[PDB]
């Protein structure tokens, strides 16, 4: 049973990147996947994706440009207080100069730097760098 759909999407992205491809076909295509890929676009780790209406949860075709090296979900969307954001960034991101802990706040799904700018924090979705 597909429990965490975003996990499947990011796993497909990782597999299709490690093999060097430039495209992925993510099947279930929820809101959260769309927002995750939109954040990745805003920061450039992804290219030009596409939603394919099925009337059936839709699908997504993702274009890459090799700039990304790893996605990944934190499957238990831990409640992250504004104090623990730095802890997650240290534990997940490889360096302080880049990388982004994509986390879901009451103000939408945002990268950790943007959430720290709004001075709001919520649950953690995943990480990209």
């Amino acid at each position: 049973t597909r429990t965490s759909v975003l996990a499947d999407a990011l796993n497909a992205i990782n597999n299709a990147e490690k093999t060097g491809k430039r495209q992925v076909l993510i099947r279930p295509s929820s809101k959260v996947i769309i927002k995750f890929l939109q954040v990745m676009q805003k920061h450039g780790y992804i290219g030009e994706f596409e939603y394919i209406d099925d009337h059936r949860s839709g699908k997504i075709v993702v274009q890459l440009n090799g700039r990304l090296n790893k996605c990944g979900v934190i499957s238990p969307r831990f409640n992250v207080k504004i104090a623990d954001v730095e802890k997650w960034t240290a534990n997940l991101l490889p360096a302080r100069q880049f990388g982004y802990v994509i986390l879901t706040t009451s103000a939408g799904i945002m990268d950790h730097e943007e959430a720290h700018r709004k001075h709001v924090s919520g649950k953690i979705l995943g990480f990209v760098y």
Partner: protein, 151 residues
Amino acid sequence: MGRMHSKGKGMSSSAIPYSRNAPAWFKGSSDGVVEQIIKYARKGLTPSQIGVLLRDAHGVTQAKVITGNKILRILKSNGLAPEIPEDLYFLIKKAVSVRKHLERNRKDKDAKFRLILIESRIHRLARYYRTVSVLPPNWKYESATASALVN
């Protein structure tokens, strides 16, 4: 590809066409289709056989495309929906058949295990239909009382 109660992994199914609206070539009327559905139900047919008949002998791709309502929903609007939902009824029919086969020959252990599987499935479906209040909250499946519902 789950096959809840076995090791199967098949995905044999049907792909509903993208267009929800009526097919261009269909000339029948929605009111006539609903009348046909009502007549078939009055003949004593479950919704699945009604859909099969409308797909084979007539141009009805599916009721929801043509009318806008589902077959069981259409029957319920006219008050012909059976007191026991069709899939659960067929499960009880199968269970009573296997129990008959068992009580007519004891040593068959494989059919005993299959009866256990069927009863587990019956319990699951009954729990679902009970949490949606289709069945009364006192409704339960019992081995002795299943025959009366089947018969």
